Amino acid sequence: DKVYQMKSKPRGYCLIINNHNFAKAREKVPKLHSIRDRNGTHLDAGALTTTFEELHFEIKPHDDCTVEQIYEILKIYQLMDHSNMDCFICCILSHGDKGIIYGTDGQEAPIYELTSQFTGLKCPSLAGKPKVFFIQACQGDNYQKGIPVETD
Template sequence: MNRKERGICLIINNFNFEKSRQNGPQCTRLENRNGTEKDEKSLNEVFSRLGFRVEVKNDLDGNEILETVGSYSKQNFDNNDCFICCILSHGNTGLVYGTDGQGVAISDLTFCFRKCLCSSLNGKPKLFFIQACQGVQPQNCVPVESDACNASHVDNVTSNDLIPGEPDFLLGMATVLRCSAFRHPNEGSWYIQSLCSELSAHYHRGEDILSILTKVNEQLSKKCVSNKTQMPQPWTTLSRKLVFNLPASPVSHITPNDN
């Protein structure tokens, strides 16, 4: 990465799920996601420091998530090195939830950036980091909360369904399929806080993103509460090592609140 502006880091941060609770029993009550503001702040700080223009969208429903991510895939990235999308929400197998309780397939979001739809990112890394449960397998710990609900989910989803079969995609998931991911109501989620901590600690040493994600896995594998733990999982088609290095001058934060 050597361009003055590395690229855009889009953060979709869903906190308020009141709309889903008003829409009826689409799934077991989706509580507001206390602590997610800590994750947004940490992601904003670390990716701004790494030269990305950070843009934050708060409390999007399902259609708005699809429309927002789709609109970014139509932008021109000729002068950028990379695109990053971070989604902080409730979820289930292969899905993230909008604030209205509508499930959005992760594959629909990553597939927006295929070669045929976003040619200006051809040969450039497209990174997606998802903080959301991918199932309801019990892993409840105190005082953490679960980013899941008991909706029906698609049991035949596999890792191959989540990212295109093309080079240069990376999907960093907070948890393996069908399992829960945890978020502390005061300190933020296990995965995002570990990701930001490891990025901050190792980017200046020239370590590539997969090495950093391996350290995240190691850190969370040792984090046990009441004999419960959480195992993140990265899936990747990256064709080269991806190393974050500091730009000449950090890019300013941009944090619009569209809702």
């Protein structure tokens, strides 16, 4: 089986956007009046840091980002030279809704607006290299129902 080259050190950048404080969302966006701070999110940021540092990525953490700050960070990495990297990872920890994630300011970023910054034409030094996005957020307000099955 063909496998992506994965031998550079660092392997690549692993961005962590870690949104905890939604005071601005509660203040400025009517429907998000009672959106809660994401207590415990630092435990995810730390787990990702440990995990991907162990796997030889260079971790780039960013805490409490508004939508504009998120776009600013991604633009930096879109324009960066990844020629000496074999991979790029971007982790987003935040609130969200259908197809979007929220900045701490309660503005919306469509997920595909984030990923599309790293296409081959937009970021040539990542062409042919894996680009991995992990999105920890709700994608709506519905509860996923359970169904009964036999135990394995």
